[PDB]
PDB file of C-alpha atoms in Angstrom:
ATOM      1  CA  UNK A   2     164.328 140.590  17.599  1.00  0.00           C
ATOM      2  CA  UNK A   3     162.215 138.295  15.709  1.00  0.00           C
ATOM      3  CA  UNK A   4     162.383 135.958  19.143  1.00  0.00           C
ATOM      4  CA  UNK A   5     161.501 138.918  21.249  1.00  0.00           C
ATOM      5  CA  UNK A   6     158.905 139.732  19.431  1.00  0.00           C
ATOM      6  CA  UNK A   7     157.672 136.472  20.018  1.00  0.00           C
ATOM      7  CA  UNK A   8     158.428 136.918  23.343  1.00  0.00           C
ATOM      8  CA  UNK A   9     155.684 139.491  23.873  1.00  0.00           C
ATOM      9  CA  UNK A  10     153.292 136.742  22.422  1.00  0.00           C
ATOM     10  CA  UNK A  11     154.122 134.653  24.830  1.00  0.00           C
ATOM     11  CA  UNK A  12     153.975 136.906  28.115  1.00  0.00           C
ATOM     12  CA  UNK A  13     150.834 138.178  26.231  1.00  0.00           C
ATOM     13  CA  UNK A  14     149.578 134.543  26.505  1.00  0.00           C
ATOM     14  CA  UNK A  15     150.887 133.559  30.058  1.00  0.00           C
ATOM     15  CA  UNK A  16     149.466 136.640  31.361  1.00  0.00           C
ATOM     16  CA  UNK A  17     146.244 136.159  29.986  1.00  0.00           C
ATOM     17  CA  UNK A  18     146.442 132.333  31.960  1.00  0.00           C
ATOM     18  CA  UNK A  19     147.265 134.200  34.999  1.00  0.00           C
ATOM     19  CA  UNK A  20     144.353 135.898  34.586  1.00  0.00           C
ATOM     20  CA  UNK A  21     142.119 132.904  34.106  1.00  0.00           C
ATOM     21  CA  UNK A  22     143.543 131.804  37.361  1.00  0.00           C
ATOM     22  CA  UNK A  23     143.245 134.666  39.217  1.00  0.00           C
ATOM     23  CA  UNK A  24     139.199 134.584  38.239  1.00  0.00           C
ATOM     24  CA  UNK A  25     138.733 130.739  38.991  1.00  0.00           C
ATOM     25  CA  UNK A  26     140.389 131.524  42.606  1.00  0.00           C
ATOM     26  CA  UNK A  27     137.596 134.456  42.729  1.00  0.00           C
ATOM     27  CA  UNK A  28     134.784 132.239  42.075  1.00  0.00           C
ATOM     28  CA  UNK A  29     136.611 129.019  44.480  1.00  0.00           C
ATOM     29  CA  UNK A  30     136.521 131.625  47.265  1.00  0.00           C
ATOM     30  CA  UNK A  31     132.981 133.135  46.707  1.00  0.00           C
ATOM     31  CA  UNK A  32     132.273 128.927  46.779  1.00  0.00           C
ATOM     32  CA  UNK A  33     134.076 129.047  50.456  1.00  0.00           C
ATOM     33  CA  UNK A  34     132.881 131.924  51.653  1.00  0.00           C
ATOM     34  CA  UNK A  35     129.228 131.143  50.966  1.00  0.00           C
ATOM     35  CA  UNK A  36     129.431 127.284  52.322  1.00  0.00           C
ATOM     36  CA  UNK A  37     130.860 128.892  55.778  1.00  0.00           C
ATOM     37  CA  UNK A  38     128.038 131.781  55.378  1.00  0.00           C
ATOM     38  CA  UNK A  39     125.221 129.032  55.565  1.00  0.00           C
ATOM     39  CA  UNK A  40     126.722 126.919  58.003  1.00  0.00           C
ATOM     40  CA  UNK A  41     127.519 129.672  60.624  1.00  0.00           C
ATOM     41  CA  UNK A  42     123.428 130.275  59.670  1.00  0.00           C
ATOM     42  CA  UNK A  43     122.695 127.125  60.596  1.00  0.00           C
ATOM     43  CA  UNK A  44     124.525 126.561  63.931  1.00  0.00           C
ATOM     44  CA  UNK A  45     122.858 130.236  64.808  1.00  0.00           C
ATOM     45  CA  UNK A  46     119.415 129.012  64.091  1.00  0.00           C
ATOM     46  CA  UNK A  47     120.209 125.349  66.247  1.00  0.00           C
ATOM     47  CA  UNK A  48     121.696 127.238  69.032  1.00  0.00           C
ATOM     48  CA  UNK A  49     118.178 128.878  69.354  1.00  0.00           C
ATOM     49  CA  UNK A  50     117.142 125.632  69.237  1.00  0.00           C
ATOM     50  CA  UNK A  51     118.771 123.839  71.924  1.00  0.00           C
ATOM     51  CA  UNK A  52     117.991 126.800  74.418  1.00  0.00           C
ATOM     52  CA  UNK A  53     114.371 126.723  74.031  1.00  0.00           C
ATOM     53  CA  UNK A  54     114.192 123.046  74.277  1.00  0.00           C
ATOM     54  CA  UNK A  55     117.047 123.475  77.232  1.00  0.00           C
ATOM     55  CA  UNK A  56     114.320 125.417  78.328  1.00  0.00           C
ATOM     56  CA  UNK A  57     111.593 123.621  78.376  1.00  0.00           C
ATOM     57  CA  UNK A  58     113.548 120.070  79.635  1.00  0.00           C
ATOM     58  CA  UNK A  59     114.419 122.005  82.676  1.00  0.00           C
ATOM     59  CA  UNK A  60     110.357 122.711  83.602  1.00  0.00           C
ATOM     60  CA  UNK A  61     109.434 119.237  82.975  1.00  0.00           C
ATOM     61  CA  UNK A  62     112.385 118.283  85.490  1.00  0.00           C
ATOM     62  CA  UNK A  63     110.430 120.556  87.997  1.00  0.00           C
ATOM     63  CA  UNK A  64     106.880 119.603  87.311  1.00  0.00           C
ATOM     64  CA  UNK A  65     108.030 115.916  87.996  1.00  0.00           C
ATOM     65  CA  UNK A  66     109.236 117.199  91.312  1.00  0.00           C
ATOM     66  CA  UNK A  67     105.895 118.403  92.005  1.00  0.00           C
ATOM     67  CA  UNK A  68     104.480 115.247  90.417  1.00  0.00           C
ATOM     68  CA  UNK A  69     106.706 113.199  92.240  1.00  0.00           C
ATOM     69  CA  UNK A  70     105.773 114.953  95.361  1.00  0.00           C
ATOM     70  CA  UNK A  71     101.919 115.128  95.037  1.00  0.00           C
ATOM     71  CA  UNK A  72     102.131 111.151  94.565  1.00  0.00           C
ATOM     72  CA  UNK A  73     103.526 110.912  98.424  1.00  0.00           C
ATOM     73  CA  UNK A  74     100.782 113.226  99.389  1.00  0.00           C
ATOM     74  CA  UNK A  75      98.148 111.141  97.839  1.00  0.00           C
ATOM     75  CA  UNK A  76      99.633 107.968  99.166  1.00  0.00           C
ATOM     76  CA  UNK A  77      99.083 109.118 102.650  1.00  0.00           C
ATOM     77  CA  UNK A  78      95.973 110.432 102.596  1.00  0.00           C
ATOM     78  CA  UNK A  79      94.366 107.117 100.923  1.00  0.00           C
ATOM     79  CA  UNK A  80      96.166 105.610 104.127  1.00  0.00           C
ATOM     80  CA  UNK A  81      94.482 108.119 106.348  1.00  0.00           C
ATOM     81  CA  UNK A  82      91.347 107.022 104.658  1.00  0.00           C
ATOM     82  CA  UNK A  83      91.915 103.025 104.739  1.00  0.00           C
ATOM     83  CA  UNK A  84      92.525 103.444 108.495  1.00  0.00           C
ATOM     84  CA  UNK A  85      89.332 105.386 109.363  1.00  0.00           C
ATOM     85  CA  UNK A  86      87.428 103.030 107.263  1.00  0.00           C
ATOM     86  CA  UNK A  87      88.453 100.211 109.184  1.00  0.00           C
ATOM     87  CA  UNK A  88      88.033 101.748 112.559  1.00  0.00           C
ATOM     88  CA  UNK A  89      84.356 102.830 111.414  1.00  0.00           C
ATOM     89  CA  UNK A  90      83.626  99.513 110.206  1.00  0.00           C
ATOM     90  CA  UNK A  91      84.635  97.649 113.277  1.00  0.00           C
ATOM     91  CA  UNK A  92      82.693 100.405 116.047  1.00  0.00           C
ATOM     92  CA  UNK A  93      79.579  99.888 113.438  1.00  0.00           C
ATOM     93  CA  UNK A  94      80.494  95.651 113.510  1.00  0.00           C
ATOM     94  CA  UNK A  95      80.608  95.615 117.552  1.00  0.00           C
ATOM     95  CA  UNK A  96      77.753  97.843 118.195  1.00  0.00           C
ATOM     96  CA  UNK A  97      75.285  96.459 116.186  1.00  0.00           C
ATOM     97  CA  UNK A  98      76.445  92.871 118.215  1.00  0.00           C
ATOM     98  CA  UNK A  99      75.892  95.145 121.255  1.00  0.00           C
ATOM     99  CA  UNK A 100      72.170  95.919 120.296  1.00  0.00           C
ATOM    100  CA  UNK A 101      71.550  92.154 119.947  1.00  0.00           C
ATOM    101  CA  UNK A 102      72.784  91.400 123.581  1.00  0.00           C
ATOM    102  CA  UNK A 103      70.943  94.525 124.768  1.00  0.00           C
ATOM    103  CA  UNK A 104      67.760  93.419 123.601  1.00  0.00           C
ATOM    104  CA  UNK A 105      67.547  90.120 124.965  1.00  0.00           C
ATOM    105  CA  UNK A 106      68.438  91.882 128.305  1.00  0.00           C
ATOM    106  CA  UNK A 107      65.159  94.034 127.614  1.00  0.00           C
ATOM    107  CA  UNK A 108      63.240  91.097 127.506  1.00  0.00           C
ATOM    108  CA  UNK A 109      64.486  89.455 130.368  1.00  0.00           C
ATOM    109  CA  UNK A 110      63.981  92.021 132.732  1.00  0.00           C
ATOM    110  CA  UNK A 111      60.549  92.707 131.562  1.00  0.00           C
ATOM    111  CA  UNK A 112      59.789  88.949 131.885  1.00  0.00           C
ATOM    112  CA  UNK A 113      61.197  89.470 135.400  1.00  0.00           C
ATOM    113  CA  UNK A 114      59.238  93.015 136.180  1.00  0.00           C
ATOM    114  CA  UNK A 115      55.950  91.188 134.634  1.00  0.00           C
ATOM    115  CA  UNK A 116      56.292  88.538 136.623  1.00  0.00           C
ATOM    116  CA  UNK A 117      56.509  90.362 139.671  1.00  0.00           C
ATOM    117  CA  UNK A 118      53.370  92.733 138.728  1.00  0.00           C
ATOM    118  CA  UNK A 119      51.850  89.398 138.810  1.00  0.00           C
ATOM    119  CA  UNK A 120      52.791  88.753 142.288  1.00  0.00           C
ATOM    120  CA  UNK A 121      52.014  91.979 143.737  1.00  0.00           C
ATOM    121  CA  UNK A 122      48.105  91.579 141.943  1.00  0.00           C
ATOM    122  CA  UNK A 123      47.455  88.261 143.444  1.00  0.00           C
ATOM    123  CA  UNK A 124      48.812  89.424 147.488  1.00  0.00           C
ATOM    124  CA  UNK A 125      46.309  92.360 146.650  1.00  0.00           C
ATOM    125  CA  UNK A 126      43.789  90.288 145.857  1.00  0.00           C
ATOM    126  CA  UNK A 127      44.421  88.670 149.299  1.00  0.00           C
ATOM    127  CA  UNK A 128      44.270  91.531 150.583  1.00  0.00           C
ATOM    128  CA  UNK A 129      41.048  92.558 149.807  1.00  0.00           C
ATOM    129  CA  UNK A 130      39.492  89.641 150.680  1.00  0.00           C
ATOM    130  CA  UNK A 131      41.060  89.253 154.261  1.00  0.00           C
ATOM    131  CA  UNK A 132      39.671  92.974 155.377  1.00  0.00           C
ATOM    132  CA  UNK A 133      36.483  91.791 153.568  1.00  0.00           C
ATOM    133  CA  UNK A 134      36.775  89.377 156.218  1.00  0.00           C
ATOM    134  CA  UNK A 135      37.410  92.127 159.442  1.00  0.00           C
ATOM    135  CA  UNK A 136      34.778  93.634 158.467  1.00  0.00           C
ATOM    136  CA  UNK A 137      32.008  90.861 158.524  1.00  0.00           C
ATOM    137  CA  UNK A 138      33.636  90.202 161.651  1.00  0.00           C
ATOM    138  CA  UNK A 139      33.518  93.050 163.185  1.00  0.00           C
ATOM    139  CA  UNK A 140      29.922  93.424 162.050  1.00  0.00           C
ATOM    140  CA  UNK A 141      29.208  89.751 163.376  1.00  0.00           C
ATOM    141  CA  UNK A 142      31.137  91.076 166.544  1.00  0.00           C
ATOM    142  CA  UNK A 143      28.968  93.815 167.315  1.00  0.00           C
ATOM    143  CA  UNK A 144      25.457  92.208 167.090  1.00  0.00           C
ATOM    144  CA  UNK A 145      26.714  89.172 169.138  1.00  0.00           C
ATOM    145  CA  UNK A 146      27.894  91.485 171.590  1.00  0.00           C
ATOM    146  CA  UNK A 147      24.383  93.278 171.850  1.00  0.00           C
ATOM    147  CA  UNK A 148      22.710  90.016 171.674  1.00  0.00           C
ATOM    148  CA  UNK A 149      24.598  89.005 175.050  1.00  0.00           C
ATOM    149  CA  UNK A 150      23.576  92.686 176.381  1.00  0.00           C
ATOM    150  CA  UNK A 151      20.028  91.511 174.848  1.00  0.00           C
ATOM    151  CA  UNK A 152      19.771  88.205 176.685  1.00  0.00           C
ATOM    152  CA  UNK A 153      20.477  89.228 180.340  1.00  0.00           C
ATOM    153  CA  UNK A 154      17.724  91.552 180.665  1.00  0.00           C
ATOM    154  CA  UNK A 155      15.020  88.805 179.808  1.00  0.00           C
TER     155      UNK A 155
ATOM    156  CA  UNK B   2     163.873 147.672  18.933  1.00  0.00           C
ATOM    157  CA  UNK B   3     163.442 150.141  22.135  1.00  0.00           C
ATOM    158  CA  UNK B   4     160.225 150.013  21.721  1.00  0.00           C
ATOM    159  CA  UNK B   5     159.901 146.319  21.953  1.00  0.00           C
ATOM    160  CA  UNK B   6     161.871 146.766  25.447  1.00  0.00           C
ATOM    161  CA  UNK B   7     159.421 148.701  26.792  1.00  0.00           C
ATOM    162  CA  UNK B   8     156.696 146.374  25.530  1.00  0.00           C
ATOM    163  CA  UNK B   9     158.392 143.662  27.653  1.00  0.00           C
ATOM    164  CA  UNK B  10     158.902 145.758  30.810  1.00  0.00           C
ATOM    165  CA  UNK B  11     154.984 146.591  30.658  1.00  0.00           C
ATOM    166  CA  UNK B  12     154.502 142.586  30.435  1.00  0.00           C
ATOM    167  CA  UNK B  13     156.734 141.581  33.367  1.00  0.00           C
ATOM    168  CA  UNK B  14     155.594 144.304  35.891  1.00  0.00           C
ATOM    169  CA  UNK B  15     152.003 143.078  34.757  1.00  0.00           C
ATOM    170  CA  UNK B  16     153.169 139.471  35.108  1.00  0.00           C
ATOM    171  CA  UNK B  17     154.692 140.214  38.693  1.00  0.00           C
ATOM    172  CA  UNK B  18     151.640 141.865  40.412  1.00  0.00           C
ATOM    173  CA  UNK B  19     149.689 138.994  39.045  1.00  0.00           C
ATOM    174  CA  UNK B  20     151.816 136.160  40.193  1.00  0.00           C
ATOM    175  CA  UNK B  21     151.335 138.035  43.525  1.00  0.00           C
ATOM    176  CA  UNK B  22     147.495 137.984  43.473  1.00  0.00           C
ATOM    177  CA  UNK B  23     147.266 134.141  42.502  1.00  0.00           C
ATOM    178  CA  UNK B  24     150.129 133.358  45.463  1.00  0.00           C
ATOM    179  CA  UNK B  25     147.632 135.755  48.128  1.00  0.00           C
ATOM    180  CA  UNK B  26     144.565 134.329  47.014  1.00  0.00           C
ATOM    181  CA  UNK B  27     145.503 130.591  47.423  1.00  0.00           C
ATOM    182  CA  UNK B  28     146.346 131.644  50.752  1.00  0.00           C
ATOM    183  CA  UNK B  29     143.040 133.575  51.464  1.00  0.00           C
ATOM    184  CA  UNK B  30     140.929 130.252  49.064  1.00  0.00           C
ATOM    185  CA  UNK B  31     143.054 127.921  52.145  1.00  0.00           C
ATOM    186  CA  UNK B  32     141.876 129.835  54.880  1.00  0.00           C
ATOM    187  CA  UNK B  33     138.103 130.228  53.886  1.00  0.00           C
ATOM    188  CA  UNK B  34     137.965 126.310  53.367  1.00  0.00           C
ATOM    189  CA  UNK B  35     139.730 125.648  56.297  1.00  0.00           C
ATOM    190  CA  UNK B  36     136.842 128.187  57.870  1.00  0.00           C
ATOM    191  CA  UNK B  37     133.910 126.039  56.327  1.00  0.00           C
ATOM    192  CA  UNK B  38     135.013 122.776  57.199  1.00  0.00           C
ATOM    193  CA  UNK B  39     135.072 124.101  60.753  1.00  0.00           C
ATOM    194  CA  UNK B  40     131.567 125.757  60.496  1.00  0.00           C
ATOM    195  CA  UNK B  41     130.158 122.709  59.110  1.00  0.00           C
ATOM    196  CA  UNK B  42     131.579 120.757  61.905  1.00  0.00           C
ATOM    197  CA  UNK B  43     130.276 122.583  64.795  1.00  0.00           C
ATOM    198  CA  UNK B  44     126.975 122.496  62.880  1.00  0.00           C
ATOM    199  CA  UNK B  45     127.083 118.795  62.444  1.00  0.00           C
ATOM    200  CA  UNK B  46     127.731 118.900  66.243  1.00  0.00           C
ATOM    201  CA  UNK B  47     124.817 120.857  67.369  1.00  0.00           C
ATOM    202  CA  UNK B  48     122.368 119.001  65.364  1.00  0.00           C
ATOM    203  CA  UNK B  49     123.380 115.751  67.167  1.00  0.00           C
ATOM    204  CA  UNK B  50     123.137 117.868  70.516  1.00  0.00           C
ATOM    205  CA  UNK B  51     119.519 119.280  69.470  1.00  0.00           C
ATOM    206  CA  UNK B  52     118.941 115.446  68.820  1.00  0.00           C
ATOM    207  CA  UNK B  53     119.151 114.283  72.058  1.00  0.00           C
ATOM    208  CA  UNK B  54     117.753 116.904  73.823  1.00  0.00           C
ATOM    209  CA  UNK B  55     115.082 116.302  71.931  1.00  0.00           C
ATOM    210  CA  UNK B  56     114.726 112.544  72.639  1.00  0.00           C
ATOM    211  CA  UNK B  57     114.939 113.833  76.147  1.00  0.00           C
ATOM    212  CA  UNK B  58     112.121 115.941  76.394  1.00  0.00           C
ATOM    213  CA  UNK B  59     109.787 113.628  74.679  1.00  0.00           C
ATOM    214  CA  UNK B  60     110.723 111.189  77.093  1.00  0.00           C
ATOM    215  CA  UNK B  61     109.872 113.529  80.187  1.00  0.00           C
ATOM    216  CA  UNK B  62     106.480 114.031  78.400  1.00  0.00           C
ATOM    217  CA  UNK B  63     105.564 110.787  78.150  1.00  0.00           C
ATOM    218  CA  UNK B  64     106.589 110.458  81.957  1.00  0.00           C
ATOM    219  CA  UNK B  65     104.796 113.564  82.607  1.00  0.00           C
ATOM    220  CA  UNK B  66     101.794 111.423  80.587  1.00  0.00           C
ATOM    221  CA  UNK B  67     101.846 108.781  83.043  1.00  0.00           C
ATOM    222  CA  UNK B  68     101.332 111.015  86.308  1.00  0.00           C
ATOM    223  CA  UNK B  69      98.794 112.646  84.634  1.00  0.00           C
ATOM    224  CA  UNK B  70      96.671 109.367  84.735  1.00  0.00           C
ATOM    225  CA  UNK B  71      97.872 108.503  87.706  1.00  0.00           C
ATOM    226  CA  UNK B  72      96.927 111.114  89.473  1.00  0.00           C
ATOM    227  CA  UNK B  73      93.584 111.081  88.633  1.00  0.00           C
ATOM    228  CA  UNK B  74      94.079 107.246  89.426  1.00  0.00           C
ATOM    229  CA  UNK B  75      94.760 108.255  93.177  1.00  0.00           C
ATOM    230  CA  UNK B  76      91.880 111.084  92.424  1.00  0.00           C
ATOM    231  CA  UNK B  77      89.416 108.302  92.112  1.00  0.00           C
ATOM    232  CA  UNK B  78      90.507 105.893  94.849  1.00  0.00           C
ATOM    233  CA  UNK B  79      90.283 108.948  97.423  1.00  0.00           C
ATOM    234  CA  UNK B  80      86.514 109.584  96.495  1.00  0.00           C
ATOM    235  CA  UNK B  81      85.750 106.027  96.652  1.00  0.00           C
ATOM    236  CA  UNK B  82      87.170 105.868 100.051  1.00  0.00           C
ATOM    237  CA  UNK B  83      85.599 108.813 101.241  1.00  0.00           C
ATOM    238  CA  UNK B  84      82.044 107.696 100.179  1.00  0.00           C
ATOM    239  CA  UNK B  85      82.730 104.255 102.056  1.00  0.00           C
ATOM    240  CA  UNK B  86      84.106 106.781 105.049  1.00  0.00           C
ATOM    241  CA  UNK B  87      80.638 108.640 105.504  1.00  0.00           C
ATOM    242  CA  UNK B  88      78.442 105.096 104.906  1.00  0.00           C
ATOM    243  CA  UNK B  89      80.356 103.455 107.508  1.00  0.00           C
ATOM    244  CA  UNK B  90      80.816 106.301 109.848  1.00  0.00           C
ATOM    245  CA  UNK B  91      76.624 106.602 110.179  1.00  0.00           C
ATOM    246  CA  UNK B  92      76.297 103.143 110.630  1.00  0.00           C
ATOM    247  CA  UNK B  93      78.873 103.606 113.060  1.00  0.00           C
ATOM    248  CA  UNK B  94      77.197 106.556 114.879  1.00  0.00           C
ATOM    249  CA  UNK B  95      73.243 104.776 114.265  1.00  0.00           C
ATOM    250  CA  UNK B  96      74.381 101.464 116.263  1.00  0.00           C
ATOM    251  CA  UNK B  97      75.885 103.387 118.994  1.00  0.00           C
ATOM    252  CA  UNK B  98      73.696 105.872 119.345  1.00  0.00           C
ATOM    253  CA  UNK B  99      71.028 102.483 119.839  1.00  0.00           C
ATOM    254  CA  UNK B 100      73.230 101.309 122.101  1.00  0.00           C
ATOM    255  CA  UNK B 101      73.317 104.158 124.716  1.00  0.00           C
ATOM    256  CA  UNK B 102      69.302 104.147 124.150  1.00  0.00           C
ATOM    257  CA  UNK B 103      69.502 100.597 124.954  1.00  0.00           C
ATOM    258  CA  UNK B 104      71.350 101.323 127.956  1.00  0.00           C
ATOM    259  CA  UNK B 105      69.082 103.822 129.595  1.00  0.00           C
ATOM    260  CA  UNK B 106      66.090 101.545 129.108  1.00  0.00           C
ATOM    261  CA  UNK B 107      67.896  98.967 131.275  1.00  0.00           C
ATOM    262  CA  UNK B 108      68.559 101.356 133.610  1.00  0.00           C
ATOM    263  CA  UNK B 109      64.925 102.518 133.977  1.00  0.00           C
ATOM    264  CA  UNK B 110      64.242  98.950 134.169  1.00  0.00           C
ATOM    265  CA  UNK B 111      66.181  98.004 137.077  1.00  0.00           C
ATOM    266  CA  UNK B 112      64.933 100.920 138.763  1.00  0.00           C
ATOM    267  CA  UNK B 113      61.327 100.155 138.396  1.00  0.00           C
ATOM    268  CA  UNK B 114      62.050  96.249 139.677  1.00  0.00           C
ATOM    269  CA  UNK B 115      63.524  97.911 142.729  1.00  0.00           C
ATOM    270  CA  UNK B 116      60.567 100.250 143.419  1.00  0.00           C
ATOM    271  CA  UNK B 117      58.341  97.175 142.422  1.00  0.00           C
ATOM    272  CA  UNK B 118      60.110  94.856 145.396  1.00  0.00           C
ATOM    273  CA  UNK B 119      60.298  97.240 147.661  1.00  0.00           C
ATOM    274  CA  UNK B 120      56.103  98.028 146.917  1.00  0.00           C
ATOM    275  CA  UNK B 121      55.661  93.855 147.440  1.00  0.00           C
ATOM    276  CA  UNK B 122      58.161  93.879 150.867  1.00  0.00           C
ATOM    277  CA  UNK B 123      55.097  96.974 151.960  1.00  0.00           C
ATOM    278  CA  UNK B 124      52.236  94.677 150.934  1.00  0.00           C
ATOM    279  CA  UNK B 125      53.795  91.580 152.654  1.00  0.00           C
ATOM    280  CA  UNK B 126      54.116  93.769 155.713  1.00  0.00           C
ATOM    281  CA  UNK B 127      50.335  95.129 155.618  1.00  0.00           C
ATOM    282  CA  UNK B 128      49.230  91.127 155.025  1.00  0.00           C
ATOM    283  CA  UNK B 129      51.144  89.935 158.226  1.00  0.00           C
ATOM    284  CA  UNK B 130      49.438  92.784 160.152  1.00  0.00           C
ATOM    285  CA  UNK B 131      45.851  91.764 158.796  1.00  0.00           C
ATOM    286  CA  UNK B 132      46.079  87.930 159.145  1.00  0.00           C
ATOM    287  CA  UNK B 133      47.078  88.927 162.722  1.00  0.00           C
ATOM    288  CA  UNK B 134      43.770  91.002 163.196  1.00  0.00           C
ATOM    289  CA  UNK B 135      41.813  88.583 161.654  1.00  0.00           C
ATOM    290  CA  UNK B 136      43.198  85.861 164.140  1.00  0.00           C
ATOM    291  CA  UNK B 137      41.879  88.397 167.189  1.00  0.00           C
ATOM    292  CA  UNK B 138      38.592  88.786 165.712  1.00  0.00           C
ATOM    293  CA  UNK B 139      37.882  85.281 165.177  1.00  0.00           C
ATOM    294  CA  UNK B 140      38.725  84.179 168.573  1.00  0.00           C
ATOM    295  CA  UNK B 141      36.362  87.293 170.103  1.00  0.00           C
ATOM    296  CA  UNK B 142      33.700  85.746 167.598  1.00  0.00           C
ATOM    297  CA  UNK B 143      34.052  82.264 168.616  1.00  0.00           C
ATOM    298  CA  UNK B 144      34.318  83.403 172.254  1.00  0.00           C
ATOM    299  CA  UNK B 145      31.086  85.760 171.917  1.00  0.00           C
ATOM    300  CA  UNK B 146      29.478  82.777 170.379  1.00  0.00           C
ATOM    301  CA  UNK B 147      29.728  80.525 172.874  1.00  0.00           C
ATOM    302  CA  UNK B 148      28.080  83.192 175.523  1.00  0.00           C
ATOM    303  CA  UNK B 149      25.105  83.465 173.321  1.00  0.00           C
ATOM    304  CA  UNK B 150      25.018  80.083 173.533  1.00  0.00           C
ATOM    305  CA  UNK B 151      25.244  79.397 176.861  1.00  0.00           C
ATOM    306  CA  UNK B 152      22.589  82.302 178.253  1.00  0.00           C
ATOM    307  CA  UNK B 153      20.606  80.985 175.752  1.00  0.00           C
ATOM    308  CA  UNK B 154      19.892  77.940 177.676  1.00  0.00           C
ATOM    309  CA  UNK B 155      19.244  78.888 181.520  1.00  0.00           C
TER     310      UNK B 155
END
């Protein structure tokens, strides 16, 4: 009995290990528990994450498209533009050429329509001097013809 | 002893149950480690996703930067276009607008040369008709002339 007696020290003993183990397994398993705890946390918080910024990728996309878009718009209205510049520039070019030309026509015919006024003043001025001329003669005409009248009854 | 025996027995069944606990929670310590590593991973995972999404949208921004200044680029280009547009469109409309004044002056021109030709072809016509009458009278003068003459000597 002396070795069971002993025996109980020893069960006594190994049990009290057991026990030991049975608390360190406690604590490695809080450990586990707790690592998994703050890393489910942490995917939770960066799946927020990537949908917000999702989020916000897929508007940018869109506002390019409208970006992208506006850019073609611009593009042909500065052609528009270019166009209607040129076309104003070269009416503006060939008319003022036009006034040049027209001008010196001005003059010319005015040289010509002077000219002629000239003409008609001097034939006018003939004119008057040739009826100046009936009429002394028909004056001169008169008296001669009363002077014959005159004559024969002397 | 008895009582030893029971001692024993009180030991074992003790002993068993705990041999039991240490055996389950190994099994429950494998499975929450097993649990972590996973978390961790998918964490790991989502960071590197969050990452790139990231680099993403900072690159659409700076795109989004660009048309920004761009835009107002093609902004500016339009109003400078436009202000050359109005300039040369009332030069445009000033030199033609000269040139249709232009036009009608000739116009009024020619006009008065014809009236004016047509006035010297009337004058011409009156002259031929006087230097006629002129001829007449200055034969009846010269004739009447000589009759004074001659009844003045009898």
């Amino acid at each position: 009995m002396k070795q069971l007696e002993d025996k109980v020290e020893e069960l006594l003993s190994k049990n009290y290990h057991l026990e030991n183990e049975v608390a360190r397994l406690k604590k490695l398993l809080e450990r586990a528990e707790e690592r998994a705890e703050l890393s489910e946390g942490k995917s939770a918080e960066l799946e927020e994450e990537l949908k917000t910024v999702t989020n916000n990728l897929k508007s940018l996309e869109a506002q390019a498209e409208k970006y992208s878009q506006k850019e073609d718009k611009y593009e042909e209205e500065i052609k528009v533009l270019s166009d209607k510049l040129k076309e104003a520039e070269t009416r503006a070019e060939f008319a003022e050429r036009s006034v040049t030309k027209l001008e010196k026509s001005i003059d010319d015919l005015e040289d010509e329509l002077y000219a002629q006024k000239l003409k008609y003043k001097a034939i006018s001025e003939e004119m008057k001097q040739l009826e100046d001329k009936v009429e002394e003669l028909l004056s001169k005409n008169y008296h001669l013809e009363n002077e014959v009248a005159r004559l024969k009854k002397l």
